[PDB]
Every structure is written in structure tokens, then in C-alpha cells.
């Protein structure tokens, strides 16, 4: 692989109207590809990351919603309001990332525009942008992955740390919280 | 239409690479010289010419995309060849890097002007020349992105 070097591309698969209809029916026949899915509700759009066969995203984006699938709506396998996590089984066709095991502190955040931005880990759930960006550049990226140099999942982007519309750091959900969530359940 | 950051270019005598960074399509002077670049509307003249840094640039052509410069300072580089091969390179200095696994010189041939990327896929520099020992490339000379930025500011 996912890194060395990390590169990403985005592809749009559904328009506004199609999204609404699919949201109501809960039946999505579109083919799936990739590690990260760009997802949307009626009020917002964000990201969902596949890790170890599970499609994870932020609770603040997905709430308790089901996910549209070829077989109709799919209920979440995991839910953790306190940790701001939700997980569904990874859609057929998707590819999963695997958790980081190298403990690196040099992270790379993948945006909804498929840009890769370097992030220096400063704590369990925070990292600073090497080069700050306007908050608009990060909008709709929550639920997206923070990868280590080897392209393995270190955490999921939760919220930016802004000051005057400028993102200087990011709060993220470390992979560890995913395990804790899966055991809770 | 899919866009590329890297162009495979050629003159009547040689073939090499060009990389788009910051709206500019850059390459090596030793390859392009003072030449213009072709376009559907005729020749386009160089925007920049830096013989000393062995650098030249034209406006980014159609079907291209600009690559972001590296700002992480990593020493783990990755050189992209004209064949789309990725060569891991360890940064040894401002404009120098050693291949993790040496390659026959032919493997790098025609790649000058191509990019050296960091772990984030950003531009650390442009491949300038292979450093060879009896037909084996063990290191590379490159133009740091900083030089590109400087050239523009000029």
C-alpha cells in the first residue's frame, strides 16, 4: 503493498439523485473496489476504511445507519458511540488494509480527494500536520485512514485541530480502539 | 480523462522524462537543451532555463497533473523509471541517493527528468544522472525540489 511510496486515486461512482434513491431502497448493485469508500448520508459525506474485513467509519457521520448493499441494507457489526466508531462487514469487492505493527511515528493521512498528507504522531490519538492546510482541504475526510510508511493502518481521521480556519493537527482514532470496540460486543 | 504527473519525452536523438510540479513540466537541460515543447498549437517555449542546475521547464501540457513537493524531509526515496518501475533509494545528501539494490545501468536508461518520491508520494527531486561502477548503477544524482522552487522565484 500500500506504500513505498503511498499514492492514491479517487473515482466517483454515484451522483446525487442515485445516492438518494439508493439510500431509501438500501439496495446498491454497484461494483466495489478499493480500500477506502467515499460514503454519504442525506446530510453528509465522509470516508469509510476497510481494515481486516471490516468497513469502519465515524459514528458522527454514520450514526446507527445501515449500509446499502447488493443484498439490501446491512446492519452494523460494531458500534461505539464513545469512541466514535461504527463498522459493517467489508463490502464484496473491497480490499482491506491491515493494522500497523512497526510503531512508526511518521504518518500519512489520506483525504477524500485522494491526497496524501504527512502527519507526525504526537500522542495516542493526535498528530500534527507537517504543513498546515485550510480546514476545507480536510472536509469530508473523517473516517479516512492514517497510514504508517509501510501503508498499514495506524488510525482513522476523526477531527481536525483548527485555529482560524487552518488545520494544524488532527485527532484520530488509533487502531487499538478498533480492537477494543470489537471485543466490547 | 486520466492525467499523468510524468511525461515520457523525446528528441530526434534521445528519450527521457519530464515531471510536472507546480504547473511546470520540468526536465534535464542535458536532455532538452533550449528546445521548445510540442503542442497542438505549435512549439511552446521554455518558461525556465537553468543550465547550472541542469534544469529546464515549460508550462504543464494538456493531459498532465502536477505533483506536490515533499515537505516531510524523509530520506526514504523512490525513483520512478520510464518503464514505471519503482526503485527504492536512500537519500545520502542534498542531491545524492544510493539504490537499496543496485541495478544494471540499462534499467535506469532514459529516466532522467523523472521523479524521486518520498513515502507520501511527493516530489523530493528530479532524477539527474545515474552514478555508475562498471555497468552497475549504485547511486543517483538528482535535482532537489528546492532548486525548482528557487528557479521559479527567480
Amino acid at each position: 503493498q500500500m506504500g513505498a511510496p503511498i499514492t492514491a486515486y479517487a473515482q466517483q461512482t454515484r451522483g446525487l439523485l442515485g445516492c438518494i434513491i439508493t439510500s431509501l431502497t438500501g439496495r446498491d448493485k454497484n461494483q466495489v473496489e478499493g480500500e477506502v469508500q467515499i460514503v454519504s448520508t442525506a446530510t453528509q459525506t465522509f470516508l469509510a476504511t476497510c481494515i481486516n474485513g471490516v468497513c469502519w467509519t465515524v459514528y458522527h457521520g454514520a450514526g446507527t445507519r445501515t449500509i446499502a448493499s447488493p443484498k439490501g441494507p446491512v446492519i452494523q457489526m460494531y458500534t461505539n458511540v464513545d469512541q466514535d466508531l461504527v463498522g459493517w462487514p467489508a463490502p464484496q469487492g473491497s480490499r482491506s488494509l491491515t493494522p500497523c505493527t512497526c510503531g512508526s511515528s511518521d504518518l500519512y493521512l489520506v483525504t477524500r480527494h485522494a491526497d496524501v498528507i504527512p502527519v507526525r504522531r504526537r500522542g495516542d490519538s493526535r498528530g500534527s500536520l507537517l504543513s498546515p492546510r485550510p480546514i476545507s482541504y480536510l472536509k469530508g475526510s473523517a473516517g479516512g485512514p492514517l497510514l504508517c510508511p509501510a501503508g498499514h493502518a495506524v488510525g482513522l481521521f476523526r477531527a481536525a485541530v483548527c485555529t482560524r480556519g487552518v488545520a494544524k493537527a488532527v485527532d484520530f482514532i488509533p487502531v487499538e480502539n478498533l480492537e477494543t470496540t470489537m471485543r466490547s460486543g | 480523462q486520466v492525467e499523468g504527473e510524468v511525461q515520457i519525452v523525446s528528441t530526434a536523438t534521445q528519450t527521457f522524462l519530464a515531471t510536472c510540479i507546480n504547473g511546470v513540466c520540468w526536465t534535464v537541460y542535458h536532455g532538452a537543451g533550449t528546445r521548445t515543447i510540442a503542442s497542438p498549437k505549435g512549439p511552446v517555449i521554455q518558461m525556465y532555463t537553468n543550465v547550472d542546475q541542469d534544469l529546464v521547464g515549460w508550462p504543464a501540457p494538456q493531459g498532465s497533473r502536477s505533483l506536490t513537493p515533499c515537505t516531510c524531509g524523509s530520506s526514504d526515496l523512490y525513483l520512478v523509471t520510464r518503464h514505471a518501475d519503482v526503485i527504492p533509494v536512500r537519500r545520502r545528501g542534498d542531491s545524492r541517493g544510493s539504490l537499496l539494490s543496485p541495478r544494471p545501468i540499462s534499467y535506469l536508461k532514459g529516466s532522467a527528468g523523472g521523479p524521486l518520491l518520498c513515502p507520501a508520494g511527493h516530489a523530493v527531486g528530479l532524477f539527474r544522472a545515474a552514478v555508475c561502477t562498471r555497468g552497475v548503477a549504485k547511486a543517483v544524482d538528482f535535482i532537489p525540489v528546492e532548486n525548482l522552487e528557487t528557479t521559479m522565484r527567480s
Binding site: A8 | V2, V6, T11, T36, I37, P61, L67
Partner: peptide, 17 residues
């Protein structure tokens, strides 16, 4: 003198058509 001509392109992310 002759122009430099573009004979091909490379996309770093591997994005397909």
C-alpha cells in the same frame, strides 16, 4: 531545431481509464 515531443505519460497512482 526540433521540439521536445511527448510520446507517453505515467500516472503515479495507477489510476485506470
Amino acid at each position: 531545431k526540433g521540439c521536445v515531443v511527448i510520446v507517453g505519460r505515467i500516472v503515479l497512482s495507477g489510476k485506470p481509464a
